[PDB]
Structure formats: C-alpha cells, structure tokens
Amino acid sequence: MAVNVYSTSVTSDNLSRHDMLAWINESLQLNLTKIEQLCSGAAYCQFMDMLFPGSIALKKVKFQAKLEHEYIQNFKILQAGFKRMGVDKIIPVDKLVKGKFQDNFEFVQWFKKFFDANYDGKDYDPVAAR
C-alpha cells in the first residue's frame, strides 16, 4: 500500500511550472510544453507504473490520446491503480480532462508530492514501457 498525501501532510515546496514540466519530461522522456497536456492522463498512468510496477494496465493506456473520451479512459485506468494501491485521493477527472491550466496544475502539485513520498529510486525506462 502507498503512502497517502493530504493537505495536512508536511511536504516539499510546490514547483514552478518550468520545474514541474522538467520533472515530467526528464523522468518519462516526454516533451510536454504545457501543464494542461497532463489532461490526457497518460503521464500519471506511467508514473504509477514507475512507482509500483504492475499497478497499472499499461497496455490499455492511450499514450497518443487527443480526444476527451480517451483521456477519460486513461484516467479510469489511473483510478484502478489508485484503488489497487490504497491511494485515497479523489481524482477530479471531469475537470482535468477539459485541458485547462489551473485545475491541471493543482492536481499535478499534489501528484508530485505523492510521487516523492513513494518513489524508491528505481531505474525506469519510460520509453521501453510505452
């Protein structure tokens, strides 16, 4: 079971958008230019596999999703991973999939704290995983 992160948890400082995109892009070998591109759910799905290999149905993830309904499919895969791992955060899927900056940036700030609380340092080939 995962370590949960709450608003009352003591965590590292929030990241700038620049540093947050650097973390995503460097860790997953991606080239996101905007935080709202996290609306597809695919990066979160991959980060869950990196934290807990086998927690996510990676073969079902649509890594090249461009339509809101596909984003929803990816987020349902993420939700199933959260449930498997005892993660009690409610993901605001309906909001995130709209692809707006503020909601997407709020969730990723939480997600990065969740990631930092659970990451074991393992090597991970995010390209080979896709």
Experimental method: X-ray
Secondary structure (3-state) at 38? helix
Q: Which residues contact 89 (CB under 8 A, 6 or more apart)?
A: 4, 5, 82, 110, 114
DSSP string, 40-100: GSHHHHHHHHHHSTTSS-GGG--TT--SHHHHHHHHHHHHHHHHHTT--PPP-HHHHTT--
Distances (CA, A) of 76 to 9, 11, 20, 121: 26, 27, 23, 26
Q: Which residues contact 48 (CB under 8 A, 6 or more apart)?
A: 55, 56, 78, 81, 82, 85
- Going from the N-terminus, what domains does the chain have, and what CATH number goes with each? 1-130 (1.10.418.10)
Of 54, 45, 46, the C-alpha closest to 28 is: 46
